[PDB]
Design an enzyme around this catalytic site. Structure first.
Site, PDB file in Angstrom:
ATOM      1  N   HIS A   1      38.210  14.878  61.331  1.00 53.43           N
ATOM      2  CA  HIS A   1      39.254  15.632  62.007  1.00 53.43           C
ATOM      3  C   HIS A   1      38.810  17.236  61.684  1.00 53.43           C
ATOM      4  O   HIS A   1      37.823  17.833  61.219  1.00 53.43           O
ATOM      5  CB  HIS A   1      40.659  15.764  61.101  1.00 53.43           C
ATOM      6  CG  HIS A   1      40.810  14.123  61.236  1.00 53.43           C
ATOM      7  ND1 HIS A   1      41.609  14.175  60.447  1.00 53.43           N
ATOM      8  CD2 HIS A   1      41.236  13.267  61.293  1.00 53.43           C
ATOM      9  CE1 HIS A   1      42.295  12.720  60.421  1.00 53.43           C
ATOM     10  NE2 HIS A   1      41.176  11.749  61.667  1.00 53.43           N
TER      11      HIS A   1
ATOM     12  N   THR B   1      51.236   7.493  60.824  1.00 54.60           N
ATOM     13  CA  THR B   1      52.703   7.727  60.767  1.00 54.60           C
ATOM     14  C   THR B   1      53.805   7.267  61.629  1.00 54.60           C
ATOM     15  O   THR B   1      54.825   7.315  60.597  1.00 54.60           O
ATOM     16  CB  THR B   1      52.052   8.176  62.374  1.00 54.60           C
ATOM     17  OG1 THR B   1      50.922   8.950  62.801  1.00 54.60           O
ATOM     18  CG2 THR B   1      52.795   8.937  63.381  1.00 54.60           C
TER      19      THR B   1
ATOM     20  N   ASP C   1      47.665  11.745  68.301  1.00 55.73           N
ATOM     21  CA  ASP C   1      46.852  11.819  67.436  1.00 55.73           C
ATOM     22  C   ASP C   1      45.632  12.243  67.680  1.00 55.73           C
ATOM     23  O   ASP C   1      45.333  11.400  68.215  1.00 55.73           O
ATOM     24  CB  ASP C   1      46.989  10.486  66.918  1.00 55.73           C
ATOM     25  CG  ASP C   1      46.768  10.589  65.042  1.00 55.73           C
ATOM     26  OD1 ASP C   1      45.561  11.430  64.813  1.00 55.73           O
ATOM     27  OD2 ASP C   1      46.882   9.567  64.423  1.00 55.73           O
TER      28      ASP C   1
ATOM     29  N   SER D   1      45.683  11.852  58.747  1.00 60.98           N
ATOM     30  CA  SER D   1      47.362  11.442  59.592  1.00 60.98           C
ATOM     31  C   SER D   1      48.961  11.261  58.394  1.00 60.98           C
ATOM     32  O   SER D   1      49.860  11.621  59.032  1.00 60.98           O
ATOM     33  CB  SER D   1      47.643   9.779  60.194  1.00 60.98           C
ATOM     34  OG  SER D   1      46.733   9.903  61.039  1.00 60.98           O
TER      35      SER D   1
ATOM     36  N   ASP E   1      49.861   1.643  60.114  1.00 58.06           N
ATOM     37  CA  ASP E   1      49.106   2.563  60.107  1.00 58.06           C
ATOM     38  C   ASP E   1      49.902   4.223  59.336  1.00 58.06           C
ATOM     39  O   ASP E   1      51.560   4.045  59.711  1.00 58.06           O
ATOM     40  CB  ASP E   1      48.801   2.876  61.608  1.00 58.06           C
ATOM     41  CG  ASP E   1      47.804   3.599  61.111  1.00 58.06           C
ATOM     42  OD1 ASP E   1      46.656   3.829  60.173  1.00 58.06           O
ATOM     43  OD2 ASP E   1      46.699   3.971  62.975  1.00 58.06           O
TER      44      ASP E   1
ATOM     45  N   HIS F   1      46.869  17.151  64.058  1.00 56.82           N
ATOM     46  CA  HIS F   1      45.864  17.187  63.370  1.00 56.82           C
ATOM     47  C   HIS F   1      44.873  17.560  64.574  1.00 56.82           C
ATOM     48  O   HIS F   1      45.235  17.235  65.875  1.00 56.82           O
ATOM     49  CB  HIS F   1      44.734  17.627  62.225  1.00 56.82           C
ATOM     50  CG  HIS F   1      44.226  15.278  62.153  1.00 56.82           C
ATOM     51  ND1 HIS F   1      43.363  15.377  63.194  1.00 56.82           N
ATOM     52  CD2 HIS F   1      45.063  14.382  62.106  1.00 56.82           C
ATOM     53  CE1 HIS F   1      43.099  14.032  63.176  1.00 56.82           C
ATOM     54  NE2 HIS F   1      44.580  13.791  62.471  1.00 56.82           N
TER      55      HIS F   1
ATOM     56  N   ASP G   1      43.106   9.970  68.469  1.00 59.57           N
ATOM     57  CA  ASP G   1      42.494  10.055  67.816  1.00 59.57           C
ATOM     58  C   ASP G   1      41.443   9.011  67.138  1.00 59.57           C
ATOM     59  O   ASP G   1      40.095   9.662  66.956  1.00 59.57           O
ATOM     60  CB  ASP G   1      43.540  10.139  66.206  1.00 59.57           C
ATOM     61  CG  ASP G   1      42.912  10.251  64.963  1.00 59.57           C
ATOM     62  OD1 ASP G   1      42.352  11.180  64.460  1.00 59.57           O
ATOM     63  OD2 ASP G   1      42.117   8.793  64.829  1.00 59.57           O
TER      64      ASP G   1
HETATM   65 ZN   LIG Z   1      45.536  11.886  62.931  1.00 57.96          ZN
HETATM   66 ZN   LIG Z   2      42.193  10.189  62.411  1.00 59.02          ZN
END
Ligand SMILES: [Zn+2]
Ligand SMILES: [Zn+2]
Ligand SMILES: [Zn+2]
Ligand SMILES: [Zn+2]
Ligand SMILES: [Zn+2]
Ligand SMILES: [Zn+2]
Lengths: 446, 446
Positions: A409, A152, A48, A99, A150, A367, A324
């Site tokens: 991000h 993902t 992530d 995400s 979460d 990302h 991330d």
């Molecule tokens: Zn992410």
């Molecule tokens: Zn993030």
């Protein structure tokens, strides 16, 4: 098909040809890596926020600039893909995704809006690659270092209008249309339990303490629901090992922390003029991480072994969340440590694939992120930190795109890499959604 | 061997499959892209500071998120490569390179320290790929939107301990060991005249106003010198177009500006809280750039015409400098426009190569840069700007890694793409120095 055995600098980097990573022509070896035979298994590894800069910073620190990740860097077919999301109201590109939208994109094949899980911009549900796998008789696995609710991991098993709908409580309040007691499929967790993947491992035990507000298991906590439904639940590494099989009769559910699982490395948070006013940093083990918490690679290990029993084949997603999260927190050691963590996971996947020979392994990110590698004397407006790398030289990292408590991000396209059957479809410029279709065709789904 | 015809989004971005860039399996097409036969020619296009972030931002703005660069995005073989330099003192990696050190790496095959041109850390000269091409009897081209004395073009024709040594004056002062009268090969410009590439096109007329101090041409300006030596001198689009031939009897020297060549697009400079305090910006054509100043594509096209007359082959480097330069200035429109400038040149190269059949074309950058793509609502510490993209949506760009008058390079690994004979050698993780050897091998040099 060959994995890249060694692409570290081959000699004295100060001498001619000393920094080369290639030892000879690659044409033949690339030709040999290109098969269109059917994949029996897929292992999708997501780091992530793991943009190209996060990979570089991590290689730089842990393996040296001319070093080489034995997992991450070892996949032969590489390309760049785009992960832009959509504005919910206009249908036009939203250049920086979260995400939710991006995971929805590769697990569903349809673009969507930031915060959306398994639904398009009209809030219509779409089938996920995991759901399709299971329906074709394939075994299914879902592994995550984050809370299991979460975005993902959730994107594979739940369909909701906001990623915030962890449990009955949040769902009734923010996704009224999804709430069980309103005739909807239910919260993320409830939907996860219904999805009934063969293997499911992560954090997020906290939400299983909620009680359902309706349905066959009204009054009972989501945990008891899982038990009443024949799930094996494990809570640590030892109990994980004790597991012998995992299937529709005895699905496995691993809850290894209340929320997110602990990060491996400790280091101070980056800081303003950190590279000039504060000493260079060397990362250290996280004291708050107990041995009994399994590691991504350890979970990836156990899942591959349980899932591979299935003769038809399996689909497995492996999700390193905290690259991330530590990136958001402007914490380079945290961030590098989780990148190292993912690399171990990739190694286990790659070596399984390498022996089985009909497994497509893919490694990418959802990302890009904030962290940048900058010159040591940089005077930057954001948060910075100097680090002592394996090379015995300092590297400075910079986090300069947010004035608030969380770095942001970025929308830059980023690396996607693959090994095995159909890995070609990852080369050149592609889009995150192509990935759903690559996996679909490889497994011959639908 | 096919060029990627179209990797734009294939349809409705909001519907399943609508954002796909692929129309089917790539294995067969990729297999047809792999040839290990000899390259007769090589065209190397360099986007200065053109990391993945820069490419994505340019694409987002000019072509739309799901758009497609007909040049930049159309090369089938892709990978990521590392461009770390060397600390001159320690011999260890310096994680963020400059133009000099990285262009020395690919044109020479050896890592070096920041600021160095064609010399290693020990300051010992090494032969460049263009000198080697010329030695093998091949035609040679050196094209640049920057000053011809600037690091990238100079690295092919000059060996100096500091990139600062434009002419005799600055050389005598900062690279005395290179100064002509101190018995050295001479300044960058004097060495450029010695190197005698068949075609040399760029800016940097200012330094040719200088007079040599020693040597055969003492007292005479380097302009006069170039002429006594048989160089054809052109200084605008029409004169360049008029040129009929370019060879060792009549090498072409194009000088199209005093310093760097004029930027294509005009736009305001990014600003503190610029994405929130100031209106979204639409880029406009630079009202100061004269139509008679050749574009990178126009120069590239003419170079190709002239160079392709040689039956042995040709080597040609095409350098787009002002991407990096506008990135330094935190000017998104300048930057994006120069990326568009580069994409046209790449097209000219791709279309020549696609029909000649034996040409290797490579597109990459010397290193990554500051500019990041961020969410429209971002409050950042650095300089930001909101842009009106082709999608009719707003993109925000952020420059957040310097408090000084100049944004900074970043060390992130970055995309390298290729088409043609030996292109396989770009796929996966490589090093900038690998590129020297790849080219060297593809032309059977040495
Ligand atoms: Zn992410
Ligand atoms: Zn993030
Ligand atoms: Zn040495
Ligand atoms: Zn629609
Ligand atoms: Zn540069
Ligand atoms: Zn620069």
């Amino acid at each position: 098909m060959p994995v890249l055995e060694n692409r570290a600098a081959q000699g004295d980097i100060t001498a001619p040809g000393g920094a080369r990573r290639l030892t000879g022509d690659q044409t033949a070896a690339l030709r040999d890596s290109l098969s269109d035979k059917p994949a029996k298994n897929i292992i999708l590894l997501i780091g992530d926020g793991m943009g190209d800069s996060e990979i570089t910073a991590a290689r730089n620190y842990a393996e040296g600039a001319g070093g080489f990740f034995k997992g991450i860097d070892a996949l032969p077919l590489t390309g760049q893909y785009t992960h832009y999301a959509l504005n919910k109201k206009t249908g036009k590109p939203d250049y920086v995704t979260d995400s939710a939208a991006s995971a929805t994109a590769w697990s569903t094949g349809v673009k969507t809006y930031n915060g959306a899980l398994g639904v398009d911009i009209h809030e219509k549900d779409h089938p996920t690659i995991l759901e399709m796998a299971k329906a074709a008789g394939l075994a299914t696995g879902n592994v995550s270092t984050a809370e299991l609710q979460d975005a993902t991991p959730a994107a594979l098993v739940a369909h909701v209008t906001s990623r915030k709908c962890y449990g009955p409580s949040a769902t009734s309040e923010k996704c009224p249309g999804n709430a069980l007691e309103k005739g909807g499929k239910g919260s993320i967790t409830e939907q996860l339990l219904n999805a009934r993947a063969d293997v499911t491992l992560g954090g997020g035990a906290k939400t299983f303490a909620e009680t359902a507000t309706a349905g066959e298991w009204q009054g009972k906590t989501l945990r008891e629901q899982a038990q009443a439904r024949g799930y094996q639940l494990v809570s640590d590494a030892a109990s994980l090992n004790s597991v012998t099989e995992a299937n529709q009769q005895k699905p496995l559910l691993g809850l290894f922390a209340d929320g997110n699982m602990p990060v491996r490395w400790l280091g101070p948070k980056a800081t303003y003029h950190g590279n000039i006013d504060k000493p260079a940093v060397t990362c250290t083990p996280n004291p708050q991480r107990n041995d009994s918490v399994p590691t991504l690679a350890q979970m990836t290990d156990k899942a591959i072994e349980l899932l591979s029993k299935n003769e038809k084949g399996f689909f497995l997603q492996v999700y390193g969340a905290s690259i991330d999260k530590q990136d958001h927190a402007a914490n380079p050691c945290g961030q590098i440590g989780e990148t190292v963590d993912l690399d171990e996971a990739v190694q286990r996947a790659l070596e399984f694939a390498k022996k089985e020979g009909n497994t497509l392994v893919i490694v990418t990110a959802d990302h890009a992120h904030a962290s940048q590698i900058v010159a040591p004397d940089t005077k930057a407006p954001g948060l910075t930190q100097a680090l002592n790398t394996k090379d015995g030289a300092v590297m400075v990292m910079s986090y300069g795109n947010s004035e608030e408590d969380s770095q942001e991000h970025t929308g830059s396209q980023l690396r996607i890499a693959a090994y095995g059957p159909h890995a070609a479809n990852v080369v050149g410029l592609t889009d995150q959604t192509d990935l759903f279709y690559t996996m679909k065709a490889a497994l011959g789904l639908k």
